[PDB]
Amino acid sequence: SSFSKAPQQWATFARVWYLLDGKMQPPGKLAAMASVKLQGLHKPVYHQLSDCGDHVVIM
């Protein structure tokens, strides 16, 4: 809980890679969570002016 300012900010705004399987899956229900993770709308630190956003790899 006690970190310095720069590594605390780096941990808060860290970018995360997600994995997603597309076998026997509807593209709309895939793209709903793909859009959410590309926004970073799963982050409580989300802001539209910030560069928050996560990578998604779909196989």
Binding site: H42, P44, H47
Partner: protein, 140 residues
């Protein structure tokens, strides 16, 4: 008696002091500055009105994010937090969501427990079982 306006420099300067940061000829030409300052002030008031709505939408997005991170939906979380007579607004709920992970996890656990309790009381079809978090506390 001929009368002329002498402080016209200050008359144009009271308009031009609000338009120094504009692009084009609106920061210099007084005819173009007045229409630009007027629309700027009108947009300032209207965006001041929309600021509360935009910040509320941001808070709802943040609460939805931090509640779906625990696997509980936003409307279920809100109504089951209200059903425990905990009245925290969405601003401070997003504030707990950002800076307070264990406390927001406890709140989400309380909301999930209240949701399961309400579903159990609905499927029971009886008034005799009253839960530990379904009891209603009156004012004192």
């Amino acid at each position: 008696l001929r009368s002329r306006v002498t402080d016209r420099y200050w008359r144009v300067q009271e308009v031009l002091k609000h338009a120094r940061h504009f692009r084009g000829r609106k920061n210099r030409c007084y005819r173009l500055a007045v229409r630009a300052v007027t629309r700027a002030f009108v947009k300032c008031t209207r965006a001041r009105r929309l600021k509360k709505r935009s910040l509320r939408t941001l808070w709802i997005n943040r609460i939805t994010a931090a509640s779906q991170e625990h696997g509980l939906k936003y409307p279920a979380f809100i109504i089951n937090l209200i059903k425990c007579q905990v009245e925290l607004n969405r601003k401070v709920l997003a504030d707990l969501a950002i800076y307070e992970p264990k406390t927001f996890k406890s709140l989400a656990a309380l909301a999930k427990r209240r949701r399961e309790e309400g579903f159990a009381a609905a499927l029971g079809d009886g008034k005799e079982p009253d839960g530990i978090f379904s009891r209603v506390v009156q004012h004192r």
